Design a protein around this ligand. Structure first.
Ligand code: HEM
Length: 137
């Protein structure tokens, strides 16, 4: 289930973080504009820029903390608030996050593994609701 998925992802966090982030960018290429240093780089090229592996790992660490603190895939309003108020997220809207979670859920479905894809889809929906409830446009 969802708790085990947190454990699976944490066990190899940099690998899943890179793969899922790349799946997002490659599914939604317009989103790469927000990540100036990644423009014009292939998957394997990104995998040698220090900021890439370090940024993606930090993003997924936070996402796992938010997931772990959730109750029945509903995140804490304080964790939504943190994500809205981050300087790095100031120009984002909820659609950016919707896209991210579409890519994440698609990744999990395509994986050979028994990820609880439906729980991640619900978590993403509830996080987007919570971002909106916290004032994200
Ligand atoms: C639940 C989803 C997300 C989480 C948990 C998350 C978390 C974070 C964290 C922890 C950082 C700081 C990384 C660092 O300084 O090393 C970060 C930076 C950033 N986030 Fe997010 N974020 C998420 C979704 C998004 C989405 C959907 C976008 C854009 C489409 C985005 C755009 C950025 C940008 C532009 C930065 C700064 C530049 C960079 O880190 O490469 N984030 N985010």
């Amino acid at each position: 289930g969802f708790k085990q998925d947190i454990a699976t992802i944490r066990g190899d966090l940099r690998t899943y973080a890179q793969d899922i982030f790349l799946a997002f960018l490659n599914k939604y290429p317009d989103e790469r504009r927000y990540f100036k240093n990644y423009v014009g780089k292939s998957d394997q090229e990104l995998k040698s820029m220090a900021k890439f592996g370090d940024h993606t790992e930090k993003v997924f660490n936070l996402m796992m903390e938010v997931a772990d603190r959730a109750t029945d895939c509903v995140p804490l309003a304080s964790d939504a608030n943190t994500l809205v108020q981050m300087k790095q997220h100031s120009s984002l809207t909820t659609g950016n996050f919707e896209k991210f979670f579409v890519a994440l859920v698609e990744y999990m479905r395509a994986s050979g593994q028994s990820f609880d894809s439906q729980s991640w889809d619900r978590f993403g929906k509830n996080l987007v609701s919570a971002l909106s409830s916290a004032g994200m446009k």
